[PDB]
Design an enzyme around this catalytic site. Structure first.
Site, PDB file in Angstrom:
ATOM      1  N   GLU A  83      -1.129  -0.385   2.700  1.00 50.51           N
ATOM      2  CA  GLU A  83      -1.024  -0.492   1.292  1.00 50.51           C
ATOM      3  C   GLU A  83      -1.280   1.054   0.698  1.00 50.51           C
ATOM      4  OE1 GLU A  83      -0.789  -2.732  -0.831  1.00 50.51           O
ATOM      5  OE2 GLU A  83      -0.803  -4.597   0.133  1.00 50.51           O
TER       6      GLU A  83
ATOM      7  N   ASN B 193       1.806  -1.281 -11.461  1.00 47.67           N
ATOM      8  CA  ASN B 193       2.634  -2.419 -11.205  1.00 47.67           C
ATOM      9  C   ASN B 193       3.366  -2.564 -12.388  1.00 47.67           C
ATOM     10  OD1 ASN B 193      -0.277  -3.861  -9.793  1.00 47.67           O
ATOM     11  ND2 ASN B 193       1.383  -3.243  -8.657  1.00 47.67           N
TER      12      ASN B 193
ATOM     13  N   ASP C 206       3.734  -4.957 -14.546  1.00 48.30           N
ATOM     14  CA  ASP C 206       3.104  -5.782 -15.491  1.00 48.30           C
ATOM     15  C   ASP C 206       2.037  -4.816 -16.118  1.00 48.30           C
ATOM     16  OD1 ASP C 206       1.082  -5.678 -13.842  1.00 48.30           O
ATOM     17  OD2 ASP C 206       0.865  -8.037 -13.608  1.00 48.30           O
TER      18      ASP C 206
ATOM     19  N   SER D 202      -0.533  -3.727 -14.940  1.00 46.82           N
ATOM     20  CA  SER D 202      -1.694  -3.782 -13.899  1.00 46.82           C
ATOM     21  C   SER D 202      -1.657  -2.487 -12.939  1.00 46.82           C
ATOM     22  CB  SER D 202      -1.934  -5.108 -13.240  1.00 46.82           C
ATOM     23  OG  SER D 202      -0.912  -5.339 -12.172  1.00 46.82           O
TER      24      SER D 202
ATOM     25  N   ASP E 245      -3.122  -1.078  -8.759  1.00 47.21           N
ATOM     26  CA  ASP E 245      -3.684  -1.460  -7.431  1.00 47.21           C
ATOM     27  C   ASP E 245      -4.458  -0.406  -7.327  1.00 47.21           C
ATOM     28  OD1 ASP E 245      -2.153  -3.891  -7.670  1.00 47.21           O
ATOM     29  OD2 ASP E 245      -0.864  -3.187  -5.916  1.00 47.21           O
TER      30      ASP E 245
ATOM     31  N   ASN F  93      -5.724  -5.337  -7.052  1.00 48.27           N
ATOM     32  CA  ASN F  93      -5.075  -5.472  -8.287  1.00 48.27           C
ATOM     33  C   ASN F  93      -6.055  -5.498  -9.496  1.00 48.27           C
ATOM     34  OD1 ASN F  93      -1.905  -6.846  -9.091  1.00 48.27           O
ATOM     35  ND2 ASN F  93      -3.155  -5.754 -10.353  1.00 48.27           N
TER      36      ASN F  93
ATOM     37  N   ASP G 156      -9.328 -16.773  -1.480  1.00 52.51           N
ATOM     38  CA  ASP G 156      -8.943 -16.964  -2.853  1.00 52.51           C
ATOM     39  C   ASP G 156      -7.892 -18.366  -2.791  1.00 52.51           C
ATOM     40  OD1 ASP G 156      -6.465 -16.205  -5.293  1.00 52.51           O
ATOM     41  OD2 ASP G 156      -8.315 -16.942  -5.681  1.00 52.51           O
TER      42      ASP G 156
END
Ligand SMILES: [Cl-]
Ligand SMILES: [Cl-]
Ligand code: NA
Length: 129
Positions: free
Chosen positions: A35, A46, A48, A50, A52, A59, A101
């Protein structure tokens, strides 16, 4: 901060990630490796809009607030900048929420693609834990 592999293993262990939700410590080290390359300051935008953040690339779409991901949530109730600290507490606390989650560690694309179904214990070999 750029951790060493065993340094990060130890810190993740201390913060209760080893076997958290059934994921052995090597899973979390392997995820962090791919990562962020163990770099707590890692950030990645990202498609969209967003972003990270940090050693586990958490995110802003869901987990933290960065004031520039319209429509997003802040489920860890933290500024995304907290995830970039040299101390991984905020990242681990948030990771525990993410992994709880529903989809477990599949939340981490790098984990799914590069760690899942591999010999993850190799990430903790030789460490004094
Ligand atoms: Cl926002
Ligand atoms: Cl699971
Ligand atoms: Na957010």
């Amino acid at each position: 901060k750029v951790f060493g592999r065993c340094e990060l293993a130890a810190a993740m262990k201390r913060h209760g990630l080893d076997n958290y939700r059934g994921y052995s410590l090597g899973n979390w080290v392997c995820a962090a490796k791919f990562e962020s390359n163990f770099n707590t300051q890692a950030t990645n935008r990202n498609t969209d809009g967003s972003t990270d953040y940090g050693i586990l690339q958490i995110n802003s779409r869901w987990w933290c607030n960065d004031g520039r991901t319209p429509g997003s949530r802040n489920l860890c109730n933290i500024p995304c900048s907290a995830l970039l600290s040299s101390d991984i507490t905020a990242s681990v606390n948030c990771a525990k929420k993410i992994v709880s989650d529903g989809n477990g560690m599949n939340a981490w694309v790098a984990w799914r693609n590069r760690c899942k179904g591999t010999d993850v214990q190799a990430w903790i070999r030789g460490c004094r834990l």
